[PDB]
Design a binder for this molecule. Structure first.
Ligand SMILES: Cc1cc(NCc2cccc(CN3C[C@H](O)[C@@H](O)[C@H](O)[C@H]3CO)c2)cc(-c2ncccn2)c1
Length: 765
């Protein structure tokens, strides 16, 4: 039955608009296969189209906003794009139609409406670009009847091992096609849909924009060569209409020019499914997916007071749709330094200089190929997998569709190497590398990131203990399915736990350090004078200078998270010996968090270091790090340490702002200094952990029940309202929020863990 559910999940999830790095395109979850993408741009002159055309996602003054209004990767969804530069409001509807043996069929409608500011006779070029990778596969445009291009539909017929036979149609569409009365029309036609079928080596087909422009440029070269000149030039839109030449190839460019509003469909029909997809099917399936989305949302994300109103529901649907709509499929090689230089051990004072020296040996090389199916922090800025971000992304996604979340977890763990390492940033293949400066591509096997994916597993385990609709929860509704899943995953979880302990160990025995356990101490590798990128809290202040004798309280807390998960999952699988080992480890961390990290004088937890005099010293910087044992759920509900942390949490002169908890205290010497990334601003992910833990204390008997209820109530409201107000005003989720003004700042379209807000509103943790 586990095999059966797996096969049905595979077929269900195979197709999607899984290219979030671009405004709109599709690909299946197969490395070398068929991929599509859309481009559009107004043309008002002979030189503007290169500057107006749109393809890869960005966010700047010429784009009002864009994103998914509704989305479910099993069914499809609807995206809206509001383009100021091109004067257009665009909708892309995508829908999936199950059937056959190759992951089913799909369709999309592309609709463009000029906004109020645009000239009513604006000319817009639209291109649908199709490529197919694979040694043996084939794809051919059926030639038109007409002399110069197509009066009606463009049909591509293709075949591959992965997809079997299929056809992909770009419909005639609706809207005015401009017509040229120029002499050129005798040789190029007066204006019509055109197709060019080309071939390039497979590894460059992703380069759609250069490939398109190389063809446009050759068309212009032809004009010049054939005496079309400035004494009597064709209109710009005709200069930029490709000469029709359909045929066979691994690239097909389908181009249309519209005057005023327009729309057209893309119909992909899997031959193994029988009857082909029509436009009427598209319209029916789009209607049905919306109805299903609405019903699931009201069940899964039932927003509680004071967020029950229609305005907050629309807000929630947007934040959620943008999060799950960010899911991509990525495939290719990644850049990794496999030297294991000894400098990377960081065992000496001044280690960051030695590690820099090793990095300058540039031993990294491409390896793989790897694949990844994952949600992402940001379409325009960070369109790829980030390890600790993904644990937060999956908490709302697991609510919606636990089977999908487990699929993504499995994808990530399938990257793990023989030692237990998963690179914290997954830049897979040339297309992915194209967005990233070369200096930032290389991944390092000694660099960790918080194991937040364990949080998602925790929720799954709790559900486990306590047709698309059926598949979405199959792994919990069938207990033996969920548990076979855990059985396969458990060894990888254990390997990663061992890896943290092997590679991120701190030093107790070499110094005058007294503690209950001589084993439990942790130090994040990879720190520089001003940063600790691997912790996730880039510029949060740490001991200065960095030192091989540092101990980081957040990392120790994350180890505690992992050991608790392993206790839960080990128990289910009957791993008796393992559980005894984990039990002793947890006891040890509970004691050592106190012995090595608790500051009585400051009333919170602190990182530690070793003095100029080789003595243990606490380094207290009150902020998120100070709260880590509470955030990760390691403190008992009656702990006096807890009570002091609640005082710090609620203190307006420290962490509490009207807009959420500040990352760093206003009273800290580093508040609002340098780049100020994690040195004051409000971050939704850590606020989310605080909210969930406050709620935990609030709904249990104990000394702090009432304090926690009060802080829970207010922090929920502060956080939700901050993200809501900014969204109302700007259309965006932001990376972080200003604690003085409440304004979203840093990057836009951060969905992204800011989307946790949907689950804070729905409550009932
Ligand atoms: C070449 C380059 C380097 C950097 N360096 C910082 C950086 C790199 C990757 C991702 C993030 C975002 N997040 C930082 C969070 O602190 C972390 O916790 C979290 O996992 C991570 C993922 O969301 C920041 C930033 C840019 C940039 N590009 C466009 C707009 C603004 N900046 C460009």
């Amino acid at each position: 039955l586990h095999s059966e559910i797996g096969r049905l999940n595979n077929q269900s999830l195979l197709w999607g608009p899984y290219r979030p790095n671009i405004y709109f395109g599709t690909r299946p979850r197969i490395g070398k296969s068929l991929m599509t993408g859309l481009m559009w741009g107004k043309i008002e002159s002979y030189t503007d189209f290169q500057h107006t055309v749109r393809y890869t996602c960005e966010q700047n003054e010429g784009m009002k906003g864009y994103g998914w209004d509704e989305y479910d990767p099993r069914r499809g969804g609807i995206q809206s794009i509001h383009d100021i530069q091109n004067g257009l409001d665009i909708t892309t509807s995508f829908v999936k139609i199950p059937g056959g043996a190759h992951g089913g069929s799909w369709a999309a409608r592309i609709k463009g409406t000029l906004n109020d500011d645009a000239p009513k006779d604006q000319k817009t070029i639209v291109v649908f670009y199709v490529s197919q990778e694979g040694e043996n596969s084939e794809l051919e445009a059926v030639p038109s009847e007409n002399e110069f291009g197509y009066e009606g539909d463009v049909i591509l017929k293709g075949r591959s091992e992965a997809l079997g036979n299929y056809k992909l149609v770009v419909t005639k569409g609706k809207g005015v096609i401009p017509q040229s009365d120029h002499d050129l029309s005798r040789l190029r036609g007066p204006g019509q849909t055109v197709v060019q079928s080309l071939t390039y080596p497979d590894e460059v087909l992703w380069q759609a924009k250069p490939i398109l422009f190389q063809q446009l440029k050759a068309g212009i070269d032809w004009l010049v060569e054939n005496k079309y000149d400035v004494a009597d030039p064709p209109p710009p839109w005709q200069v930029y209409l490709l000469a029709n030449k359909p045929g066979s190839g691994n690239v097909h460019i389908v181009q249309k020019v519209f005057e005023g509003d327009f729309e057209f469909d893309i119909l992909f029909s899997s031959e193994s499914a029988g009857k082909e997809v029509t436009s009427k099917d598209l319209e029916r399936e789009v209607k049905q997916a919306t109805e299903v989305f609405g019903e699931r949302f009201a069940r899964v994300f039932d927003l509680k007071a004071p967020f029950q109103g229609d305005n907050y529901k629309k807000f929630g649907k947007s934040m959620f749709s943008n999060l799950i709509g960010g899911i991509g499929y990525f495939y290719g090689h990644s850049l990794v330094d496999r030297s294991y230089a000894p400098e990377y051990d960081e065992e000496n004072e001044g280690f960051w200089e030695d590690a820099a020296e090793a990095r300058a040996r540039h031993q990294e090389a491409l390896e793989g190929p790897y694949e990844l199916f994952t949600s992402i922090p940001s379409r325009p800025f960070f369109p790829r997998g980030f390890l600790w971000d993904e644990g937060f992304h999956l908490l709302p996604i697991a609510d919606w569709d636990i089977d999908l979340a487990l699929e993504i977890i499995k994808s990530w763990y399938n990257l793990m190497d023989e030692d237990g390492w998963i690179a914290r940033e997954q830049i897979l293949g040339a297309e992915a590398r194209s967005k990233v400066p070369k200096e930032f591509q290389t991944q390092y096997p000694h660099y960790a990131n918080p194991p937040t994916l364990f949080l998602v597993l925790d929720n799954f385990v709790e559900r486990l203990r306590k047709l698309d609709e059926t598949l979405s929860t199959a792994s919990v509704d069938n207990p033996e399915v969920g548990l076979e899943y855990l059985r396969r995953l458990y060894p990888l979880l254990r390997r990663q736990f061992d890896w943290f302990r092997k590679t991120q160990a701190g030093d107790i025995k070499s110094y005058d350090r007294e503690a209950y356990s001589t084993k439990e101490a942790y130090r994040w590798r990879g720190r520089t004078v001003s940063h600790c990128l691997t912790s996730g809290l880039d510029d949060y202040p740490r001991p200065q200078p960095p030192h091989p004798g540092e101990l980081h309280v957040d990392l120790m807390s994350w180890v505690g998270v992992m050991v608790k998960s392993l206790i839960s999952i080990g128990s289910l699988l009957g791993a008796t010996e393992d559980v005894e080992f984990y039990t002793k480890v947890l006891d040890a961390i509970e004691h050592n968090l106190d012995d090595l990290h608790w500051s009585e004088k400051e009333g919170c937890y602190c990182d530690a270091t070793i003095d100029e005099f080789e003595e243990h010293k606490l380094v207290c910087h009150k902020g998120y790090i100070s709260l880590f044992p509470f955030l990760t759920g390691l403190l008992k509900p009656d702990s006096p340490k807890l009570g002091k942390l609640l005082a710090l949490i609620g203190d307006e002169s420290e962490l509490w702002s009207p807009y959420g908890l500040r990352s760093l205290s206003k009273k800290d010497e580093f508040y609002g200094t340098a780049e100020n990334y994690w040195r004051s601003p409000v971050w939704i992910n850590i606020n989310y952990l605080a909210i969930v833990q406050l709620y935990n204390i609030a709904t249990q008997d104990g000394p702090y029940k009432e304090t926690a209820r009060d802080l829970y109530t207010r922090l929920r409201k502060n956080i939700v309202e901050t993200v809501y107000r900014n969204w109302e005003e700007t259309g965006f989720a932001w990376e972080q929020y200003n604690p003085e003004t409440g304004k979203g700042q840093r990057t836009q379209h951060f969905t992204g863990w800011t989307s946790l807000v949907v689950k804070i509103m729905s409550g009932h943790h």
